[PDB]
Amino acid sequence: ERHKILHRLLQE
Amino acid sequence: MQLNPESADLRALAKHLYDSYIKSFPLTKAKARAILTGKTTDKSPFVIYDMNSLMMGEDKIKFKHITPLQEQSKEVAIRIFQGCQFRSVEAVQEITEYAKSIPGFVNLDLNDQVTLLKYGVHEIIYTMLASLMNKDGVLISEGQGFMTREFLKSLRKPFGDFMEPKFEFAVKFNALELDDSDLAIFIAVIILSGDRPGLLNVKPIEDIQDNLLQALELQLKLNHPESSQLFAKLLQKMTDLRQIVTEHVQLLQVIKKTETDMSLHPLLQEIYKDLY
Ligand SMILES: CC(C)(Oc1ccc(CCNC(=O)c2ccc(Cl)cc2)cc1)C(=O)O
């Protein structure tokens, strides 16, 4: 949420 | 110290992290030292040591991040800053990919994974930057170039103050004489620090860092016979890393506050957000 890009990176 | 199925697993863990470490980052320490001492069939990095050489370099080095079609501040300090941003953004991805290969990490709470990455990333970056440094300068553009320490110090304020603390840190850290096998485990220990702000499910993290810490100590006892205290000396370095990050954040705020809104990449903003 506050780390949308980092979330994406970890979710792929 | 013993040869039991525990230690055999420790060593298997060390090989796995190493194998993954090799394929996750471009320029290993082994290659960097080779480049740094001429011992390589690779051409030889273009040296940037003054403004004239910087300009000649932007032409004769094929930077992964530019094209003849974009602009491209007129001011060399800002341009250098921008290349750093791009390199950091790439490194965040290599570190993520590496983090995912740490046994267990990928089963943590996804929210905690984010947190470990957010705090670990720059500590790992400065750890690994030392591999590229000697006291005279730093390999750049995947070893295609070498930018001198004094040339970096001569960029206008504040930019001339970013690399210096990293060089100082590198000189001391490189004296530890760690190799890539050591480093692969160390940076894993960093990622799995259970004392980062905002973790929700700390126990599973500490359990993994624990194995990591054993794999590290075994590794340093096997790999450095002539180094009685390497394990503790190395743990202490995690401390200087946190202060390097802190210092770097405070300088980052002289920029922004006083630059030109030559903004930070959003991934980088994300990381610095509510850091310390
Ligand atoms: C880019 C920025 C704003 O500030 C910085 C300025 C300079 C450097 C050092 C330049 N070197 C690198 O970024 C770098 C990163 C990863 C690896 Cl494997 C090698 C080299 C690092 C960070 C940052 O904090 O991300």
Beta strands in chain B (DSSP E): 46-48, 133-134, 137-140, 145-148
Interface test with B, best of A1, A4, A5 (most B CBs within 10 A): A5
Q: How many CA atoms lie within 13 A of B209 on its CB side?
A: 17
Give dist(CA B193, CA A4) in Å, integer.
22
Residues 6+ apart with CB under 8 A from B110: A7, A10, A11
**Residue B122 counted as an annotated binding residue:** yes
- Radius of gyration (C-alpha) of chain B in whole angstroms: 19
User: Which of B153, B170, B222, B191 has the alpha carbon at shortest distance from B32?
Assistant: B170
> For chain B, how are helix, strand and coil distributed in percent, rounded to 5?
65, 5, 30
B114/A10 CB distance under 8 A:
yes
Contact (CB, 8 A) for B216 and B143? no
Q: Which atom of ligand 1 is nearest to the CA of B128?
A: 18
Structure tokens given for B26: 């471009």
- Of B56, B240, B242, B245, give the one whose Cα is nearest residue B151: B56
**B24-51 CB burial, b ≥16 within 10 A, e <16:** bbeebbebbbebbeeeeeeeebbbbbee
| Resolution as reported, in Å | 2.4
The helix (H) or strand (E) run that includes residue B125 is helix B110-129
Structure tokens at B172: 């001391």
- Residue pair B276/B162 in contact (Cβ under 8 Å)? The answer is no
- Quote helix, strand, coil % in chain A, to nearest 5: 60, 0, 40
Q: Which residue has the tokens 């103050």?
A: B161
